[PDB]
């Protein structure tokens, strides 16, 4: 698990607009990972931008870590 | 194992100068991976360049796939 978590964080931090991973909760459902995470974003991004960054994160992380079968990503202002 | 192999190939293909992964043999030594691989390179690169590309591959792949504890990388001309 720690290895997979590190990969998740690393992958999310490489997406344009991510200001760190604020929270990540991952669990195994069998051999699959289900995860929920919160990213920081620029407070001055629009809500639509923040939604776009979240969807980019989801795409990036799921594309890199094939065992993830469910990933929810939300955003919070971070300075 | 197949998952780790895919990661190895993907990581090697992203290094400047790699013209595919020609061969990859990976084995588990306990929970660690030991691997030997051959990359393609431009026939017109110098032997020194090809050595540099191999060392870049080793660095890239070991940095991405933490379970690898031994990785030998050689090069062959590829068109
Ligand atoms: Ni949308
Ligand atoms: Ni040297």
How far apart (Å, rounded) are the C-alpha atoms in residues A37 and A31? 19
Eight-state DSSP code of residue A18: -
Method: X-ray
> Could you give the domains of chain A?
7-77 (3.30.70.1350)
Q: Ligand 2 center to residue A3 CA distance, Å?
A: 31
Size of interface A-B (CB pairs under 8 A): 6
Distance from CA of B27 to the nearest CA of A (A): 19
Q: Which ligand is nearest to the CA of A58?
A: 1
Q: Which residues of B touch A67 (CB under 8 A)?
A: 3
Q: Which residues of B touch A65 (CB under 8 A)?
A: none
Tokens at A51, concatenated: 């939604």
Tokens at B48, concatenated: 């020194």
How far apart (Å, rounded) are the C-alpha atoms in residues B62 and B56? 10
Place of tokens 């870590």: A65
Place of tokens 């090809």: B50
Say how many C-beta atoms besides its own lie within 10 A of residue A65's C-beta. 20
Torsion angles phi and psi, residue A60, rounded to 5: -60, -50
User: Reduced to 3 states, what is the DSSP secondary structure of residue B38?
Assistant: strand
Q: Which residues of B touch A66 (CB under 8 A)?
A: 3, 6
């Amino acid at each position: 698990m720690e290895a997979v978590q590190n990969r998740i964080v690393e992958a999310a931090e490489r997406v344009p607009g991510v200001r760190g991973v604020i929270h990540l909760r991952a669990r195994y459902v069998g051999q699959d990972i289900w995860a929920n995470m919160i990213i920081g974003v620029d407070p001055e991004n629009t809500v639509e931008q923040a939604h776009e960054i979240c969807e980019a994160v989801q795409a990036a992380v799921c594309g890199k870590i094939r065992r993830i079968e469910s990933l929810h990503v939300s955003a919070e202002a971070r300075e």
